[PDB]
Amino acid sequence: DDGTINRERSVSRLAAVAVNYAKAGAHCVAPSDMIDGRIRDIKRGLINANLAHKTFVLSYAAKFSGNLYGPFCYQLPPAGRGLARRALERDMSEGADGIIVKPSTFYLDIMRDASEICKDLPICAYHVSGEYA
Amino acid sequence: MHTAEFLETEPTEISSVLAGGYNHPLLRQWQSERQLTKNMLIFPLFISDNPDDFTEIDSLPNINRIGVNRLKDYLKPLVAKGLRSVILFGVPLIPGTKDPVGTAADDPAGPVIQGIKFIREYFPELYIICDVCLCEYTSHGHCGVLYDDGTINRERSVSRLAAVAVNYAKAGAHCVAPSDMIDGRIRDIKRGLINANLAHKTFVLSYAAKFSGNLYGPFCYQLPPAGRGLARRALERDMSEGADGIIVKPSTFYLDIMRDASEICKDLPICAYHVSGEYAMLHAAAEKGVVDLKTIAFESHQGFLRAGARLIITYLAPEFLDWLDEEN
Amino acid sequence: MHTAEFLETEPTEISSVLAGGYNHPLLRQWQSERQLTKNMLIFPLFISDNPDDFTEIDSLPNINRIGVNRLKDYLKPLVAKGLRSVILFGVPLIPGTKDPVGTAADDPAGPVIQGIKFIREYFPELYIICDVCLCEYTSHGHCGVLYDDGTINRERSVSRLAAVAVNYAKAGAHCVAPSDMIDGRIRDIKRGLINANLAHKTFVLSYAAKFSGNLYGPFCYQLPPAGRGLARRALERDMSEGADGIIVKPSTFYLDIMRDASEICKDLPICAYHVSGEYAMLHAAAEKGVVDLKTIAFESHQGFLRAGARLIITYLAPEFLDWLDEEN
Amino acid sequence: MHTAEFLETEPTEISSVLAGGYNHPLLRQWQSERQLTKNMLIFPLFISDNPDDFTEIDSLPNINRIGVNRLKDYLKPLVAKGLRSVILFGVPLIPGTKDPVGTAADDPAGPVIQGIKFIREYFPELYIICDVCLCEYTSHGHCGVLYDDGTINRERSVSRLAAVAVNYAKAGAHCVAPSDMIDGRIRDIKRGLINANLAHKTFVLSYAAKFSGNLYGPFCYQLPPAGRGLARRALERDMSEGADGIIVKPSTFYLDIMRDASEICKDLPICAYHVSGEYAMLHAAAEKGVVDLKTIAFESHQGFLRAGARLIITYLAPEFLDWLDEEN
Ligand SMILES: [Hg+2]
Ligand SMILES: [Hg+2]
Ligand SMILES: [Hg+2]
C-alpha cells in the first residue's frame, strides 16, 4: 500500500518465473532483484519442479547502486563493504552455484572479496552499460 | 489464460534479512568502513621553472604548470578551503638542464626545491610530499641512470635517486614518494635518510604499486596489469624495506590490488592515486553526459575508502573541499 | 517375495544439490580453475653436438637428438603451430669433452649455446629456458663437482653451476632452470646474474621439487617420494633465494606436492613437468589400448592446471598445439 | 681456451642445508608422513552369481568373477597373508534379475549378501565393506531410479539406495560405501541406518570424490576432472551428512584432490582408490618395460600415504601383502 516491497509475495512470484524459464528450456537463471532470501526459494522451487540438477543458479549477490546504470527497492550501498560480504555468504548458503558482481570495474575490491569468500564458486564480472558507454 | 503463478514459500529466515541495516540514509554512513573527510585529499602540484608560469595542461584537465610567483594565489584559496597536503611535481623548462643523470634533480634552485621552500614559509600548515624520480630531469627521460644504449643501471640510478630523495628531505620536505619502481630503491632511500639523520622526520610513501596502462597518457621497470602476484611481493618488499605508507596506482581500475594492499600492508596507511587518465576519463564522460561528474566522483572515491585507502591523491581535490562542506 | 524396499525420505536439502553447477558441457569449463591454452606448453629440446643429428631416443618416445642444422625444420612447423617456448638440453657427442668439472658446459661452441644463438635469430619469437646442470658434461656424470671418490663438493659444484647459469644468460637465453638439487644453488645463481647485471632479464625457474622414482629411466642430492615435508621446505627455500618460478617433477605422481607448491609459492607461476617416464608410460598404455592417448593426455594435463600449474613442460607438446585448435 | 669459470661464493646458509635430514636409507622412512602396512590394504571382490564361478576379467587384470563356492580358497591364503579387509562387488549373472529399480539389489540370496554371510562365518577376521549402487542391478544400468526416458529421479533412487544400504548392514556387513554420487544420498543412508538402529555399528565410507575419466573402462551424476571446487564442496557436504570416512577416486591422477580431502576432512580417515584403469595401466606399462612394476607400485602407493590417505583400495593387494613382509 503505496509503499515498500512485499517480500514473501514478490519472492513467491519471482521463484515462479524462475522455474517457468527453467521449464521452458533455459540453462541458467540469474535473479536480479536483491530481495532477501529470493535464492533459497528459487532453488527450492527448481527442486520440487525437479530441475535442481539442470539449472545453474547464477545470483547477482552483489548489485550495488551508482550512476552507472542510467544517468542521474532493495540495493546495497557503494560504501557498505560488509553487507556485500554477508550478501554473498548468504546466497552461497542458499544454493547459488555461481555469483555476479556488479557493477564491476568500480568494485574490483568487492569482486576480490567474492573470490575469497565464494572461493569454490565460479565468479562472474558484469561490465554495466554505464561503464561501457 | 496466462495467469501469474506464485510458488509456495517457507517462513523467511532471519539470516536472509540484512536489508534493515541499510534503509535510512544515515545507516548508509554507518555502513561505510570509513567516511571521506577533507584531510584525506592530497593535491598534486606541477611547479614549472618559469616562475611566472600557470600553463594549462590537458586531455580533459583543469590542471596546470604554475610558477613560484603564482603559487601564493592558486594555493591561497584551496588552503583556506582546508587543504592539508600536496605532492610536488617539478617542471624544468629552461633550454639546458636535462642530462645523463638528472643532475638538475636535487637542484637547490629548481621548481621542486624552490617550491618546497616557498610553502614551508607562506603556508606552514600544508604537508609536503615530493615525488622522487629521474624521469623528468633526464635527456633520454627514462626513470634512472641507463647503460649502453639499453637497460637501466639499477645500483647507479638508485644511488642517484636516494641522493635526490635526501636533498628534498634536507630542503624541508615532509614526505618523499619514490615513483621509479627500480628494485630496492626503498631500502636505500631509507638508509640514506638515516645516515643523513632524517629517518625520524621523513615519511617514506612508496609507490609500491605502479602498473602500466593507457591511463597515464594515451596510446623501464613497471608491473603488468594482470600480474597480481608481483604486486603482492612488491608491497611486502617495500614494507620490509622501510616504507611507512604506500601508493597504489592507478586506482579505480585496481581496487582489488588496493584491497590486497590493505590486507598485506595492514598496519601502513594506504593511499589511492586517481591517475590523470581516470581523471580526464571521468570529465570526458561527464561532458557527453554518460554520467554526472559529482555523482561518479564520490562513488569512485569511496571506492578508494571502501577498497582500503585512508588517503587519496586526486585532481578532484579543488572540488571535494567545496563539496565535503555541504549538507542539505 | 523379494520386493524392492524404498526408505522414507525427508525433503531434499538445498545444500546437497551441486549437480546443477556442472551439467552442460560449458559449465564444465566454467568450473575449471584454469583452461589449457597453447602458450602454456613448453617443449624440451635435446640439441646434439653433431649438427647433422636427429637421432631418435626411446622407451616409448617420439623425441630426438637433433643437430643445429636440422633445427630450422623440426622447429619451423611447431612454431607456426603457435609454440612459444622451449627448454634446451645440450648433447655433447664428441669423443673428448667430458671431465672433472663439466668445463665443456658453458662452452660457447656447444649444443646448448650454439642452439640458443640459433633461435634468438631464426625464431626470435620463442622463449628460451635452459636446463642448468653438470650431470651431462661430466666424466663421472654426477650433477656437481665431487670429492675423493665420494660425495659432491657443494660449494665447488655450486660455484661452477652459477658460472654456466650466467654464461647461458650472457649468451642470450631468457630463462635458466637449475636441475641439480644441490643446496643453496639458487641464492648463488641469482647473485651471479646480479653482479653479471642480468638479474632483471633472466627468469630463474627452479626445479624446487625434483623427486626420485622409476619414472626418468627404468630400474647425488634428490628428495624422497614420501618426504612431503622436505619438498615444502625445499620450495620455501628456493622462493626465498630468488626463484621467480618453480618446477615440480615428476608431476602426475606428485599432484599433491604440486598442490603444496601453489599454496606455499602462491605468488610464483608454478610449472608442471611431465617426465619421460610418465610420457612413455602413457603411450605404452595407449598401445595395449588400456586407454585412448588423446583422452588420458588432457585429463592428466588438466590435472596439472587444477592441481596448480599455469605452465607445463611436456613431450605431448607436438600434439596439444594441434588439438587445442579444435572445436567440433 | 675455453676454461671452466667458477663464480665467487658467499658462506653457505644453514637454511639451505636440508640434505642431511635425508641421507641414510632410514631417514627416508623417518621423513614419510606415514609408512605403509598390510592393514591399510582393502581388497575389492567381484562375487558372481554362479557359485562355481572364477572368471577372469581383463584389460591388464589378474582380477576375477568368483562364486560363493570358490571363495574359501581364493580368500584363504590372502587372509593367512594378513589381509584384514575387502570391498564386495556383487555380480548377478542369471538371465532375469535386472529391472527398473534394481530390486535384486538388497536380495537376500544374491552375490553380495550371500557373500557377506559367507565371510562373517568362514573368515570372521576380515572387515567387510560393501559398495552401494544401483548401476549393476538395473536394466538401463544407470546408477539410480530414472524418469521418462531421461534423467535420474533423485529422491526415488536415493530412497531406493538407502534401502539396500541398510539391508547389507542388516545382513551383517561392517561398512557401506555408496558409489552413486546422487546428491544427499548420504544424509539418508545415515538416517536409515539410524532408524534401523545400526548407526553405531556401520561405517559410512562415502565416495565423496568420484570423478570421470578414461580410467574405469576405455573410451548420471559425476564430477568434472577440472572442477576442483565441486570436489571440495562435495566432501564438506558428505562430511556434514554423516560420512565417517571418505573415498577419493580415481587416485594417482587426483592426488591434489586427495590432498584437499585431508585438509578439509582432516578428522576423517581418508581412503585412496587405485582404479582398474590406473591398475591395468601400470601392468601394461611394466610389460613393455617402461618401468618395473614393483618399483612403480609402492611409489604410486606411498603417493597415497603422502598425499593424505591412511587406507587404500587396490588390486595390488595380493602383491603388497607379500612384499611388506620383506626386509633384505
Ligand atoms: Hg619517473
Ligand atoms: Hg643434472
Ligand atoms: Hg554405480
UniProtKB/Swiss-Prot annotation, chains B, C, D:
SMART domains: ALAD (SM01004). Pathway: Porphyrin-containing compound metabolism; protoporphyrin-IX biosynthesis; coproporphyrinogen-III from 5-aminolevulinate: step 1/4. 5-aminolevulinate 2 binds at residues 276, 315. It catalyses: 2 5-aminolevulinate = porphobilinogen + 2 H2O + H(+). GO terms for cellular component: cytoplasm; cytosol; nucleus. Pfam families: ALAD. Inhibited by divalent lead ions. Binds 1 zinc ion per monomer. It comes from the Eukaryota. Coiled coil: none annotated. One of its GO terms (biological process) is protoporphyrinogen IX biosynthetic process. The modification Phosphoserine is found at residue 240. Zn(2+) binds at residues 133, 135, 143. Catalyzes an early step in the biosynthesis of tetrapyrroles. Binds two molecules of 5-aminolevulinate per subunit, each at a distinct site, and catalyzes their condensation to form porphobilinogen. This is Delta-aminolevulinic acid dehydratase. The lineage of its organism: Eukaryota, Fungi, Dikarya, Ascomycota, Saccharomycotina. The gene is HEM2.
